[PDB]
Amino acid sequence: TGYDLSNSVFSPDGRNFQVEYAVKAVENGTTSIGIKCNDGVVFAVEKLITSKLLVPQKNVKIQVVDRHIGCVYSGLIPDGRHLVNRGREEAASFKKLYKTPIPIPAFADRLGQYVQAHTLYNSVRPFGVSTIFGGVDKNGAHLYMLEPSGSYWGYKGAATGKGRQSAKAELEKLVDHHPEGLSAREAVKQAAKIIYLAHEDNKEKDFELEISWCSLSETNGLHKFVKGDLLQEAIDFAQKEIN
Amino acid sequence: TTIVGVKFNNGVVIAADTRSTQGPIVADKNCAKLHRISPKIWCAGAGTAADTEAVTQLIGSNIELHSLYTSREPRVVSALQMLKQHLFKYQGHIGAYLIVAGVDPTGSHLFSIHAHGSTDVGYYLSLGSGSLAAMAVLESHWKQDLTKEEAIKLASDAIQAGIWNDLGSGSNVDVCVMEIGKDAEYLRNYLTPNVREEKQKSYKFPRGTTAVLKESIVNICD
């Protein structure tokens, strides 16, 4: 054997074991989710409070690309930052040549091709993150999830990390109970609940909630963080549902 | 130089004179200005003679390789695009002015190319120092729906206008006919209206006329 020692090597199955090993690092990380809604998208993430010495609200994990795209990830945090840095370069060159801000499907393939390229050679390591991202463009709202292999699809809802199965189950209920659609303000409240419910799989350390959103009506098509009264309202909604 | 291209019923014809010059001096009284890019795509060249020949040979080589790669007969627009992108890259420093003409699976085509990399389309075209003499004949006698024999006559008449009226052009008329569905026929020295008259005297010298200092057998063998 030895087929799992080097990246870009096919095993006798037709599998790249190094990529599957990178998926394990992703499964080890904290929970993160994405919810598509009527006219936009909502993102949320679990931040583990390791110590009292961590400054609240001052270790931000959700990242913005351009002005209209949000990105969140689970796994190796530095690898995620590297991927966003590239995303920001790709989005910048698109806007430079073609004027219009990069469409979400167009942006999705730019990350996809870059991540896929890191499965082609033994001189590089695959990415240790699954990345949930999306935003609003000319054709409306788009939510995407990208994996270490370079694989990505569009989603109604998406989840990754240690509590992915719990969150996926809760997401599937929202798709069934709301066939006509879910509103943006509702999706923020639901996102809070789904992080609190998914925290049951990581309950030794208590946590800090962080939410962001893009909506055609509520945020005018731009990416913003949820803070203050609207954040506390979503926390209280989540607290009431666990009890 | 005088060069023309004329479209007709089932194809296209190009023609040229046969004079080559260095300044006011005639270097070659019977050069062939009709170059071959591909079997059914022919090229007529004016401007700097080394450039027109060099550029035509390069693109003809790359066209052959492309034809073999694609398993298809080469198209005139491929030669046009490759020529014009090459010339444009050199900003007019390659002084080639060409009339490109040929038949391919798409049909019959006639284009012109300039040293800076611009191109034109037309039913009748002319390039070179005798282009104005030729274009005058073309503008007077050209019509829509020309036959093969009519187009050859019109083309060679336009070249003759250059031969007689332009000092840069002279000697004979070359023609190449490219009809659809047939082989292209190259008509080297199609007209020879400038034959040198018998000289008044023979200048054969008596043997021994030239004074010699040294004789020696030269060794060419190994």
Partner: protein, 231 residues
């Protein structure tokens, strides 16, 4: 085992062993403590010597007038990273006439360490850093690890026996955070914190190293007879 030959290889459980071995070099290094209030931020570092005839290895490095760090692990790697920080702080000043935010300083160190963990031939950095600074949003303390992970904190400690000081600061959190407009008292709290990581040895005049930055105080380092006040 078979998956620790280089940094480009993942283990079957999804671990990067070369990165974890680099993390081990920090644990071998001498203890250093960081803490802040709202007005000031303080670094306290225990220096180490080869023997009685040798000097004590300098642990604290200045990056700008408003920013600097303390190191634990491979000192040459700290020199490379601190030099990179000096350049980035300087680029921010020359081009934008802007003091580099302590948060952006961390983001830049993270991205530099990451590239070394994803390419063949290279190796991870073998050092951990505590960055303090005062910028437009007040006092700051950061913890850098060579995995790439950077974290903002009220207080912390890294190196050998760092868990003793880290527990003390976790108890003292409510007290030392409100030491505003008083440098000497914030240092005293830091000197008392590092003391919880000492075994057999005590804090002497050429052993202790303290640094401070704040509202009306540039990043300055104290060594020798200047630290005799706090013993």
């Amino acid at each position: 085992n078979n998956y620790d030959g280089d940094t480009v290889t993942f283990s079957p459980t999804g671990r990067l062993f070369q990165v974890e071995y680099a993390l081990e070099a920090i644990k071998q290094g001498s203890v250093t403590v960081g803490l802040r209030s709202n007005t000031h931020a303080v670094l306290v570092a225990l220096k180490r010597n080869a023997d009685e005839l040798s000097s004590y290895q300098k642990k604290i490095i200045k990056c700008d007038e408003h920013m600097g760090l303390s190191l634990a692990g491979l000192a040459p790697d700290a020199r490379v990273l601190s030099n990179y920080l000096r350049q980035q702080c300087n680029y921010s000043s020359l081009v934008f006439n802007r003091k580099l935010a302590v948060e952006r300083a961390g983001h830049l160190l993270c991205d530099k360490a990451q590239k070394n963990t994803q390419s063949y031939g290279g190796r991870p950095y073998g050092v951990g850093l505590l960055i303090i600074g005062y910028d437009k949003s007040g006092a700051h303390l950061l913890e850098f690890q060579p995995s790439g992970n950077v974290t903002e904190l009220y207080g912390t400690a890294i190196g050998a026996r760092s868990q003793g000081a880290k527990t003390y600061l976790e108890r003292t959190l409510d007290t030392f955070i409100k030491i505003d407009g008083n440098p000497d008292e914030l240092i005293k709290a830091g000197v008392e914190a590092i003391s919880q990581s000492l075994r057999d040895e005590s804090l002497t005049v050429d052993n202790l190293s303290i640094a401070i930055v704040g509202k009306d105080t540039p990043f300055t380092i104290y060594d020798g007879e200047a630290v005799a006040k706090y013993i």
